[PDB]
């Protein structure tokens, strides 16, 4: 019904701002502290993905109808959550690799040296833990949207209102996930509670980021605010 429209909008929003692993032409290039060259390619894709994540957000029904400040607050806080979740749906367990939105495919050691560093095994374990879920575009998109429209975030001007935007998303995931997996409805809470593991990783991820803004001079300039200022 009207939920299928929401599912289709969120799937389309995800598909346009993030192509699937299977439809993506791959290309390629020991553990060290940081490979500055991989970091440049990694940081250059992470920037593009941020922009695409903002595009994805503006495509979500009623996101842009928030206060432009709350919009900034939400994107600024779910930022890494979505990046980490997105790259983890590009994991290939045969090769133990991850594929970026331009086709770039790095293995575990390259992901490590690209900037993952001490967080490498956390992220890769999380990606493995996603494989049994067999998530598709709609489910990945919904989980992202649920992660973005979060009324828990502080400095929200209309926190109750974000909570209202999140509700139809939680319903959509519930029915969509369980329709595709009719004999095992536990997959829905199992998929939501991945957000819990995602926050943990992202939290340590924010540790990693400040370390790199200093060890790599002039890295990660702030850019969600101003793009969303326009």
């Amino acid at each position: 019904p009207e939920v299928g429209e929401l599912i289709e909008k969120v799937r389309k929003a995800h598909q346009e701002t993030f192509p699937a692993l299977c439809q993506l032409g791959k290309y390629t290039t020991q553990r060290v502290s940081l490979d500055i060259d991989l970091w440049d390619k990694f940081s250059e894709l992470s920037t593009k993905c941020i922009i695409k994540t903002v595009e994805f957000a503006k495509q979500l029904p009623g996101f842009t109808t928030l206060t432009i400040a709350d919009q900034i607050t939400l994107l600024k806080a779910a930022c890494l959550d979505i990046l980490i979740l997105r790259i983890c749906t590009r994991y290939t367990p045969e090769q133990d690799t991850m594929t970026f939105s331009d086709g770039l495919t790095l293995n575990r050691t390259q992901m490590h040296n690209a900037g993952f560093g001490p967080l490498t095994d956390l992220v890769f374990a999380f990606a493995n833990q996603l494989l049994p879920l067999e998530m598709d575009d709609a489910e990945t998109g919904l989980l992202s949207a649920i992660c973005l429209i979060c009324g828990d975030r502080q400095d929200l001007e209309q926190p109750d209102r974000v909570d209202m935007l999140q509700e139809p998303l939680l319903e959509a995931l519930k029915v969509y996930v369980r329709k595709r997996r009719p004999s095992r409805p536990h997959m829905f809470p199992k998929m939501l509670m991945k957000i819990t593991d995602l926050r943990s990783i992202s939290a340590k991820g924010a540790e990693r980021v400040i370390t790199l803004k200093m060890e790599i001079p002039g890295s990660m300039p702030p850019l969600i605010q101003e793009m969303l200022e326009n």
């Binding site: 828990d152 502080q154 939680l170 319903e171 809470p189 939501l192 509670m193 819990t196 943990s200 939290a203």
Partner: protein, 217 residues
């Protein structure tokens, strides 16, 4: 038959069982020691927890003790206005938390935990299930058979959602709304572990060793 695998009623039995020098750090430490002395009593009354191997019992408890206590004193603080009701009965307020160096955690507990449980009127049964979900955490490292543990956790998912459909049919998305406290609970629980060096819980006794002696008791 979801509620028969993981009985709601037996879970609330576990909650209702272990339900309860003056300065901030002392007040927090002594409130922690109290609830720590009775987790093993709580977990034992959780359906099928005791049927797990004893080394797995230790692991699950050492893995979620902080996050089980935070969940519990957050829901207890719904009564207090702009403060925390410790298990010892004391009211702790912002300044007192700043004195203890945990003002930011205090604020997050209030907005992300107490207020949310207050606004959605989370009852003690749902809190118990949420804590049971925290207890049956299959990622707990070193666990002998995690498949049994998240089979148990998924039984709590089944029971809790069944209970929510029953007691609150007009709120279909309420099961999810409850679960969304678990990321906040984890987020806050992580920050608290950063302050353990300042809060000597028990005679600096290893949390690990403490629970085991409670279990083999």
């Amino acid at each position: 038959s979801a509620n028969e695998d993981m009985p709601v009623e037996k879970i609330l039995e576990a909650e209702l069982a272990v339900e309860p020098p003056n300065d901030p750090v002392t007040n927090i430490c002594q409130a922690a020691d109290k609830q720590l002395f009775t987790l093993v009593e709580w977990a034992k009354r959780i359906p099928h927890f005791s049927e797990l191997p004893l080394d797995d019992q230790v692991i699950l408890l050492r893995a979620g003790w902080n996050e089980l206590l935070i969940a519990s004193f957050s829901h207890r603080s719904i009564a207090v206005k702009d403060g925390i009701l410790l298990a010892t009965g004391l009211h702790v307020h912002r300044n007192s938390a700043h004195s203890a160096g945990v003002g930011a955690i205090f604020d997050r507990v209030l907005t992300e935990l107490v207020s949310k449980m207050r606004d959605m009127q989370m009852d003690k049964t749902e809190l118990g299930c949420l804590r049971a979900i925290v207890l049956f955490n299959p990622d707990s490292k070193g666990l002998s058979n995690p498949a049994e543990v998240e089979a148990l956790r998924e039984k709590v998912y089944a029971s809790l959602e069944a209970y929510c459909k029953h007691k609150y049919p007009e709120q279909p998305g309420r099961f999810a709304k409850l679960l969304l406290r678990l990321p906040a609970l984890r987020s806050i629980g992580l920050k608290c572990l950063e302050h353990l060096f300042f809060f000597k819980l028990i005679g600096d006794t290893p949390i690990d060793t403490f629970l085991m002696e409670m279990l083999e008791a």
